[PDB]
Design a protein around this ligand. Structure first.
Ligand SMILES: [Mg+2]
Ligand SMILES: [Mg+2]
Ligand SMILES: [Mg+2]
Ligand SMILES: [Mg+2]
Ligand SMILES: [Mg+2]
Ligand SMILES: [Mg+2]
Ligand SMILES: [Mg+2]
Ligand SMILES: [Mg+2]
Ligand SMILES: [Mg+2]
Lengths: 233, 207, 118
RNA sequence: UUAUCGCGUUGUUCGGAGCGGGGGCUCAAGAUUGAAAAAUGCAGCCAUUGUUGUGAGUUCUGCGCAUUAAAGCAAAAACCUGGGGU
RNA sequence: GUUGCUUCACUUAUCGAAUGAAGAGACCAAUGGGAUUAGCGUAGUCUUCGGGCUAUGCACCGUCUAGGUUCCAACCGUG
RNA sequence: UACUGAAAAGGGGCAACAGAGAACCUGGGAUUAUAUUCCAAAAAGAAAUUGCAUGUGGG
């Protein structure tokens, strides 16, 4: 007649019932590589960072980043199969006509690779340059904003070499340059250049002098605030 | 010349501690969350003697804080400890002989033993038989306590260091004359190879 | 990979592929019908051995010193159509292994000795 | 239901935290029945015989885990029982 | 404007200790952060005309609690 | 049906033929010489113990 179902709660205070298994992630001993790759980020935050390196933490926004990556994606370079098919068709054309030009120029695309991008910047063929912000070792691209400023080339610093590599069809890219586009994308390129110039080229005086780092941890900040409040008066 | 005996003893060799019959090291329990915020209650299970040591040792049983099992601790016992006694260790613990408290909670003028110089080292000062420390004063601005040591020196320690209340048992051991060479032989048999002692003027210039 | 309940990290469990059986590296032809001839070398004809044949139904052999009692029994069954109820062994001071073999009393050790030729 | 009193050892002790008496429950070490086992062994010669008691000495064992002691008397495998839930 | 010596408050190098790296700190809020959590005003100033820098406001990241008191609520308190 | 994948902090091994551990006893007319090791169906015989399978009773 009477259900024997009942609540039988447990007490989890000190010296009481055995507790459930808590999450120990923040207090466990991790592998060495995990610990070191976290402490490296902390140390990069706490020290005084010179402007030449600090400029790489000030990236382009989300919307312009997405738009530029879309443009690069639509002008991606041709793949192994596509190159083979085009060359085979050129070969059959030459076979049927032993005379006549062949026009083996390949379709218009973006310039990729550090050597070729540096050459395009130095010869002032590039209309716009995009640089990844996390290349290791960083000396590979540390001088590129200075070169672009010296030659008056529009440039931006964006968030991931992996995203650049996805746009161009590889695993990773350090930098990418647009030298020319079709007639239908001229407006897109001009507006992108305007936004990029607003963020980077037109703020050169600030970018060349601003320092970074010197960021306390949250626990240090809270201690400082509570002490200031306590000693008021 | 040849190597002097005091330098030879540093190689180890036949002059190390005779430890086969000893029980483990004697320590307080670990300074964990329960001790920092509440208290723990253990039961004294046995009082024993170990070779080489004048004081008595106590085996104390606690419950494990995280698992279903029992934990046994081995401490240096104060005078008056008895089997079946309840022992309290932690932040909120009453003033009674054998309890373990943070130094900042013990009123000035109290007599303590098993004091840790730095918090969490599990006891390093006033451990030999019959010895103790006296609490002189607290300082709340800097959180530090002043102590008088058995030697008669004064020392300042953090007020979060722990100490047991009472005096080490087995006192008065050195007041009975030994009278025989064989008694010294048996006394050092449990410690190490350091007896009998030959005077330096009885040796030769080479050594 | 979400919530760890231990104070130290231990290695996670991953998929392991078992090893493959390679083609054999030993290709010498070994006949399986001649091993008993390696196991059992020849009989002994000393005075003690002769005394054991008649009164205890026992035969004495020199055998391969790395052989054991079970394989000596099986070799006896293969070489002669007899059943051994007991094998005792010793290693002699000259290095050879000797076996005392008792037959099951449904066979005559004397007749087996006559067939063997000793 | 005992008390100044009783119980006990060669011996340095035990009792209202339960002495002694009447009845029991258990553990250790012996004993006594049988089975094995006379079918064996020994000694005189197809037959005979065939052993039961007392002292002394012996460290197994029991006196359970109080020798000097500022000396206080190894460890583990393997195994046993219980508390829990299955 | 540099340089030396030196006081004090800090923490990330380094040093000592403990632990089977077993419960740190906040939520109680700034002399704090931000365009991918800087969004919006005010003043000056600069600009490659797209927007910046400096100063001071307003937002947002912003939150829950045993107990002690006086249905809510509030004040204490701090896991 | 192998496969597959939850728990259990603290790598692998050696070091005692007097420590720990360890299921068997007597008889023999049974040797030139070995025996708690050999003895043959009346095993002279009487046991204890380990592994795996039968069946009988009980779960
Ligand atoms: Mg040592
Ligand atoms: Mg001399
Ligand atoms: Mg000299
Ligand atoms: Mg053998
Ligand atoms: Mg004795
Ligand atoms: Mg070994
Ligand atoms: Mg042994
Ligand atoms: Mg053996
Ligand atoms: Mg002999």
């Amino acid at each position: 007649v009477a259900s024997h179902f009942a609540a039988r709660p447990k007490n989890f205070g000190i010296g009481q019932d055995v507790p459930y298994a808590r999450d120990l992630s923040r207090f466990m001993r991790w592998p060495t590589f995990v610990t070191m790759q976290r402490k490296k980020r902390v140390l990069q935050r706490r020290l005084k960072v010179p402007p030449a390196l600090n400029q790489f933490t000030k990236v382009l926004d989300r919307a312009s980043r997405n738009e530029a990556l879309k443009l690069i994606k639509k002008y991606a370079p041709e793949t192994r199969k596509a190159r083979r098919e085009r060359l085979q068709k050129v070969a059959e054309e030459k076979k049927k006509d032993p005379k006549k030009t062949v026009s083996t120029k390949a379709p218009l695309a973006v310039v990729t690779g550090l050597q070729e991008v540096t050459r395009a910047i130095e010869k002032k063929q590039a209309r716009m340059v995009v640089i990844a912000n996390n290349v290791d070792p960083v000396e590979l691209v540390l001088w590129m904003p200075n070169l672009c400023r010296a030659n008056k080339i529009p440039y931006a610093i964006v968030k991931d070499m992996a995203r650049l590599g996805d746009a161009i069809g590889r695993k990773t890219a350090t930098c990418v340059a647009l030298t020319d586009v079709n007639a239908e994308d001229e407006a897109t390129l001009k507006n992108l250049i305007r936004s990029v110039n607003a963020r980077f080229l037109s703020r050169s005086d600030v970018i060349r002098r601003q320092w970074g780092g010197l960021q306390l941890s949250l626990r240090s900040r809270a201690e400082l605030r509570k002490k200031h409040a306590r000693n008021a008066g | 010349g040849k190597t002097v005996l005091s330098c030879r003893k540093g190689n180890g060799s036949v002059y190390q501690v005779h430890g086969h019959k000893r029980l483990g090291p004697a320590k307080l329990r670990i300074l964990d969350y329960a001790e920092r915020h509440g208290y723990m209650r253990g039961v004294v299970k046995s009082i024993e003697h170990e070779a080489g040591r004048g004081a008595a040792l106590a085996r104390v049983e606690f419950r494990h804080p995280y698992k279903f099992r029992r934990v046994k601790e081995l401490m240096v016992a104060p005078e008056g400890m008895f089997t079946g006694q309840s022992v309290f260790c932690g932040q909120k613990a009453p003033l009674a002989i054998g309890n373990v408290l943070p130094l900042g909670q013990i009123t000035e003028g109290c007599i303590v033993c098993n004091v840790e110089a730095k918090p969490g080292d599990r006891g390093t000062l006033a451990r030999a038989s019959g010895d103790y420390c006296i609490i002189i004063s607290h300082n709340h601005e800097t959180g530090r306590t002043r102590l008088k040591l058995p030697s008669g020196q004064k020392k300042s320690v953090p007020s979060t260091s722990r100490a047991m209340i009472g005096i080490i048992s087995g006192g008065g051991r050195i007041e009975k004359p030994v009278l025989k060479a064989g008694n010294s032989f048996y006394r050092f048999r449990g410690k190490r190879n350091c007896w009998p002692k030959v005077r330096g003027v009885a040796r030769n210039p080479v050594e | 990979r979400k919530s760890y309940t231990r104070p130290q990290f231990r290695r996670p469990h991953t998929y392991r592929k078992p090893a493959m059986a390679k083609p054999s590296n030993r290709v010498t032809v070994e006949s399986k019908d001649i091993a008993a001839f390696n196991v059992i070398r020849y009989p002994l004809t000393t005075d003690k051995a002769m005394k054991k044949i008649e009164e205890n139904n026992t035969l004495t052999f020199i055998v391969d010193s790395r052989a054991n009692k079970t394989e000596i029994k099986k070799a006896m069954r293969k070489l002669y159509q007899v059943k051994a109820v007991k094998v005792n062994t010793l290693i002699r001071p000259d290095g050879l292994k000797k076996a005392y073999i008792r037959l099951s009393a449904a066979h005559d050790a004397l007749d087996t000795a006559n067939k063997i030729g000793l």
